A paper describes a structure:
The CotB2 protein sequence exhibits a modified aspartate-rich DDXD motif12 deviating from the conventional DDXXD motif and the NSE triad NDXXSXX(R,K)(E,D) as found in bacteria and fungi, that is altered to a DTE triad in plants.
In order to biochemically confirm the importance of the entire C-terminal region for catalysis, we generated a C-terminal truncation of CotB2 terminating at R294 (CotB2ΔC). Indeed, CotB2ΔC was an inactive mutant, not capable of catalysis as shown by GC/MS. Co-crystallisation of CotB2ΔC with FGGDP resulted in the open-state conformation with no substrate bound. Additionally, this data provides further evidence that the salt-bridge between D111 and R294 is not sufficient to fully close the active site. Interestingly, there are two Mg2+-ions bound in the CotB2ΔC structure. One is fully occupied Mg2+B and the other one is partially occupied Mg2+C, which can only be fully occupied if properly coordinated by the DDXD motif upon substrate binding and the accompanying conformational changes of the active site.
Author numbering:
A (entry chain A): 16 to 293
B (entry chain B): 16 to 292
Amino acid sequence: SSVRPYLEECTRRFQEMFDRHVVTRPTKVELTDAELREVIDDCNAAVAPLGKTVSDERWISYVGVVLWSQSPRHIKDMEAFKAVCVLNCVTFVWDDMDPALHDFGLFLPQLRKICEKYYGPEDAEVAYEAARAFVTSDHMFRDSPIKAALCTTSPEQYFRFRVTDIGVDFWMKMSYPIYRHPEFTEHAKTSLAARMTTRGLTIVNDFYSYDREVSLGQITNCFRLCDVSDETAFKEFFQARLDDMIEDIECIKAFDQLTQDVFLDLIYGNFVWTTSNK
Amino acid sequence: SSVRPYLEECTRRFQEMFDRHVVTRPTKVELTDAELREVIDDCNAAVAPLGKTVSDERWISYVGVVLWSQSPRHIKDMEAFKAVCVLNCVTFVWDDMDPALHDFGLFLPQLRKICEKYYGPEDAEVAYEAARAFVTSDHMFRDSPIKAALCTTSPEQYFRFRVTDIGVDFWMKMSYPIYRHPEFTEHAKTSLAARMTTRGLTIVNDFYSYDREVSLGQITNCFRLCDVSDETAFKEFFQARLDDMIEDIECIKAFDQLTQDVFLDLIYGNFVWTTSN
Ligand SMILES: [Cl-]
Ligand SMILES: [Mg+2]
Ligand SMILES: [Mg+2]
Ligand SMILES: [Mg+2]
């Protein structure tokens, strides 16, 4: 099965919702050539002990979500920004990888090295723990009865799983040092930040990765909760997910102005990057 | 307004739900008089810097939730257990205290000192960070526009707020060393543990503290999302919450056996303790 018959309409309705409810467009962080080579050098060094060879073009496609989905107005720490670039990219490679090749003894110390290079001592522990928790979660739930139960029961249980499994809690806990904004720092550490952005990130990511994931037999996708071959059922389910995104976006506007900018930029920027060609 | 007309029926239906879906009864951890005195002295020392004397009796009514809602058969570390007894009690008094007497500079070192007595170096930092985040969240959100939005929009937004605000995540992150169970430790550190148990704990807590909290102008209660004065609207809302608890409980049974016993003892033990003295 496939969502191809809805690809155009659903893209348009996503963009329309964002135009009406966030308005402010995402903007791409521009890395200098120096910064980008430093980032790729770190990514390559981190995945070397696993024997993987990743092309420059691969790294650049991975890093685009960070370039598009941070909040450049509010950036204060570019060392922290580069850390997110590197941690996002190497996690991507680890999640795109045959779990038989998952060597935690070789990979985990490379994650700690990245965090220790770019963050202060306190922030390095926070960022590293979320990274460790993410990759351990991913490993723990491949072919787990829990994943099947949470992903097939209801939209609520699936998104409850996805708070961690899509990596947004990880993302928040390594991204707050970029902004040094006290309120945002707390929302990141309570995971309220991740809970507020999970659905908008996951619904978008799920729609544009449905065809690929179901072809590989993966179940971590909310559109498996409806009959995508029944146009009527699909339209109702898609409107419900838009209704979730909107509700979340409206409550996000009750947060302080910087924090709200970061959340909405993350959701809206993730849609731009996902629907972009590179 | 009041949920008093529904107290007996809802209590019976809560109990019925647990007998049908959890079956296994919660059991009370009993502390030796030495163990309990150790807990209380620590509690007292932690809150003295704030000028607070607290009776043994009041400490014991606070600690009851820990004695009832942990999973006695799986306990392996009683030092960790006493830490939870203490951290729970002193955060109770910090929650029921005037936000003007909130001295973060005095209290946070006492929390750290508790975690350092009872936990290993690594577990101390985890328990301490969750305690810090809880009391800081509690301070951030009094009179916060965010709290107003999250508690009045939808049940989903409300329970999303309570994952932290009712302290489950804190509870999970200071309780996992009690059990030394690797799956539970991960489920607690990702907060999936708190996410699975938030609604079961919140709905029961909200029902039985509704009258007190609404009379105090507090809005952190799912039952203000419905008209409790309209029996038909209240019954419908209550059944919706019962359905939430049943779905979570049925999903919890997919976790490994030890983890799910901990999750279910927590939710069921909380109900028992809530409805007791
Ligand atoms: Cl930590
Ligand atoms: Mg995907
Ligand atoms: Mg409170
Ligand atoms: Mg209450």
